[PDB]
Amino acid sequence: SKLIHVPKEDNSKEVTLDSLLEEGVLDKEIHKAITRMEFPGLTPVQQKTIKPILSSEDHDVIARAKTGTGKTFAFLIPIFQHLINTKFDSQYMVKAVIVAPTRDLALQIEAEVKKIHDMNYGLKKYACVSLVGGTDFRAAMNKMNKLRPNIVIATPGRLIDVLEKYSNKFFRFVDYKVLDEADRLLEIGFRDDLETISGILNEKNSKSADNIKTLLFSATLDDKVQKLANNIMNKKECLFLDTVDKNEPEAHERIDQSVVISEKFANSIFAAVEHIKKQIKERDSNYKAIIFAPTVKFTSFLCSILKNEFKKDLPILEFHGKITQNKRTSLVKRFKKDESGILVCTDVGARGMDFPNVHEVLQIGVPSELANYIHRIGRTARSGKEGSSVLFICKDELPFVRELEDAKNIVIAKQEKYEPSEEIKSEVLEAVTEEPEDISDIVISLISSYRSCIKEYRFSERRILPEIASTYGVLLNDPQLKIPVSRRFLDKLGLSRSPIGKAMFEIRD
RNA sequence: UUUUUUUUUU
Numbered sequence: 451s452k453l454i455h456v457p458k459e460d461n462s463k464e465v466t467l468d469s470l471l472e473e474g475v476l477d478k479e480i481h482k483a484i485t486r487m488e489f490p491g492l493t494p495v496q497q498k499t500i501k502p503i504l505s506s507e508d509h510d511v512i513a514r515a516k517t518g519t520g521k522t523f524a525f526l527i528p529i530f531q532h533l534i535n536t537k538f539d540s541q542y543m544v545k546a547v548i549v550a551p552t553r554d555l556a557l558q559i560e561a562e563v564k565k566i567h568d569m570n571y572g573l574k575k576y577a578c579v580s581l582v583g584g585t586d587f588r589a590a591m592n593k594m595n596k597l598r599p600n601i602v603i604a605t606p607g608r609l610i611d612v613l614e615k616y617s618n619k620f621f622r623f624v625d626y627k628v629l630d631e632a633d634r635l636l637e638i639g640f641r642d643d644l645e646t647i648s649g650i651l652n653e654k655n656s657k658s659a660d661n662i663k664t665l666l667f668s669a670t671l672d673d674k675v676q677k678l679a680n681n682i683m684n685k686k687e688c689l690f691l692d693t694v695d696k697n698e699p700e701a702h703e704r705i706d707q708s709v710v711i712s713e714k715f716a717n718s719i720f721a722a723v724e725h726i727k728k729q730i731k732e733r734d735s736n737y738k739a740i741i742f743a744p745t746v747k748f749t750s751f752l753c754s755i756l757k758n759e760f761k762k763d764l765p766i767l768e769f770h771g772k773i774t775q776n777k778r779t780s781l782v783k784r785f786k787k788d789e790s791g792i793l794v795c796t797d798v799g800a801r802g803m804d805f806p807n808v809h810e811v812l813q814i815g816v817p818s819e820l821a822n823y824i825h826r827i828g829r830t831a832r833s834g835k836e837g838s839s840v841l842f843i844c845k846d847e848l849p850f851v852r853e854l855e856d857a858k859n860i861v862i863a864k865q866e867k868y869e870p871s872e873e874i875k876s877e878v879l880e881a882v883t884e885e886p887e888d889i890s891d892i893v894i895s896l897i898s899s900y901r902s903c904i905k906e907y908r909f910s911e912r913r914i915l916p917e918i919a920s921t922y923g924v925l926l927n928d929p930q931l932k933i934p935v936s937r938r939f940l941d942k943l944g945l946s947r948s949p950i951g952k953a954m955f956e957i958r959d
Numbered sequence: 960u961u962u963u964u965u966u967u968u969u
């Protein structure tokens with residue numbers, strides 16, 4: 451299908467809620483809702499996408515816009531307008547399906563729909579239900595039946611689950627599907643699910659298999675997502691609306707980026723602790739920060755250290771996929787409202803989540819994928835605000851920083867070295883209550899995570915894996931101690947004959 | 960000795 455490029459341009463007439471109202475694109479009721487939010491104007495992506503999304507042209511839409519620049523309302527505004535345009539047709543049926551890669555992001559998008567409802571009670575007739583995992587299935591279906599929503603927001607697993615059982619009842623009249631964080635939903639492990647969802651929706655559609663229009667949004671995407679999305683895009687024309695220059699870096703330019711390079715992976719923990727201690731002092735505890743880590747087990751470990759160091763100064767919140775869904779939701783609600791605190795998380799919180807007035811994004815080690823560097827740091831500097839980010843890595847992770855320059859055109863000007871004092875090491879290690887078996891589990895989780903991104907980040911396997919493994923000895927304060935394991939385990943790892951495996955493990959079987 | 964998410968509360 452034909453991809454039509456509409457690139458970023460300089461002096462082009464500003465689009466406003468009024469001008470869209472005056473020109474007949476937006477109805478009074480949706481103009482009213484958004485006006486009462488009292489935004490200075492419409493963001494660039496909103497100005498660019500609202501009219502094309504609503505145009506009677508038979509096209510799909512792809513939109514690129516930097517983190518924190520209002521992509522959510524860029525799709526919700528025209529979705530509401532479509533619901534108004536067709537209000538007497540199939541009024542009890544789902545007309546728009548929005549899919550997100552995480553439950554908390556799905557729930558956030560729903561909360562934003564509810565804000566529109568709150569600014570104009572006349573829009574409540576266009577009801578919304580979220581379909582996400584870790585929530586009661588029956589309670590959610592009771593809500594579908596009671597409210598007969600025109601808008602569904604969902605994560606892929608639970609959406610497929612509902613569709614296999616109830617696609618005929620609610621989903622035969624869908625006109626739009628939206629992939630938020632589209633590039634993420636089209637990677638391995640979501641792409642097949644999105645193809646399944648798209649196939650069901652197209653097959654059940656009462657008008658035709660090509661009826662549904664598809665909208666893709668992300669801060670990180672290009673021409674190549676069209677290829678990846680080929681089986682889910684129905685229309686013969688695809689509009690690519692871009693608010694970023696072709697060669698311009700995708701990272702938000704307002705973020706003051708830096709990297710702190712240690713000799714050892716474990717030293718990044720000490721660097722981060724000292725950085726946080728200094729920020730708490732200098733800002734008189736007026737400090738709101740998010741710190742990312744590579745694995746669930748390590749995030750949990752890092753939370754223990756940060757609580758021991760900083761619980762007296764700031765709240766420390768632990769956010770990952772093994773936290774119960776009730777707690778994930780309640781902690782997201784709190785950190786959205788709070789003026790200060792530290793959110794410690796995995797890449798579950800890398801994309802989409804909008805926590806106002808975060809001062810800094812910190813990262814210990816590398817993201818779960820290259821693009822997530824851009825999304826991670828984009829948790830700060832949202833809707834016009836300032837922000838900073840610090841990447842704490844060790845020397846053997848430097849090829850990641852080179853790949854950021856090579857692949858994404860991101861050059862971090864501020865780079866410095868770090869070496870921990872014996873004082874900080876003692877302070878951090880002595881409060882660690884984890885048993886050796888727990889430290890082993892934690893470091894093994896890191897070995898696995900790093901092993902999986904060696905090719906993508908161009909690491910040297912023979913250097914990076916031993917360095918990650920050596921964290922075990924560092925944390926037990928004995929640097930020639932290796933991780934005790936079984937031969938059966940080493941065989942499973944595929945390192946039984948490797949000198950790399952010999953440098954990491956001791957067969958204490 | 961589940962590497963990040965993502966139905967199984969249908």
Ligand SMILES: Nc1ncnc2c1ncn2[C@@H]1O[C@H](COP(=O)(O)OP(=O)(O)NP(=O)(O)O)[C@@H](O)[C@H]1O
Pocket residue numbers: 489490491492493496515516517518519520521522523668669801802803804828829832833
């Ligand atoms: N026109 C506007 N003017 C000012 N703020 C806005 C506007 N539209 C939305 N916002 C706010 O901007 C913040 C970020 O919007 P959001 O839609 O989450 O960004 P996004 O582009 O999806 N970011 P990401 O998902 O991180 O790539 C939210 O707090 C919105 O309320």
Ligand SMILES: [Mg+2]
Pocket residue numbers: 521522630802
């Ligand atoms: Mg978003």
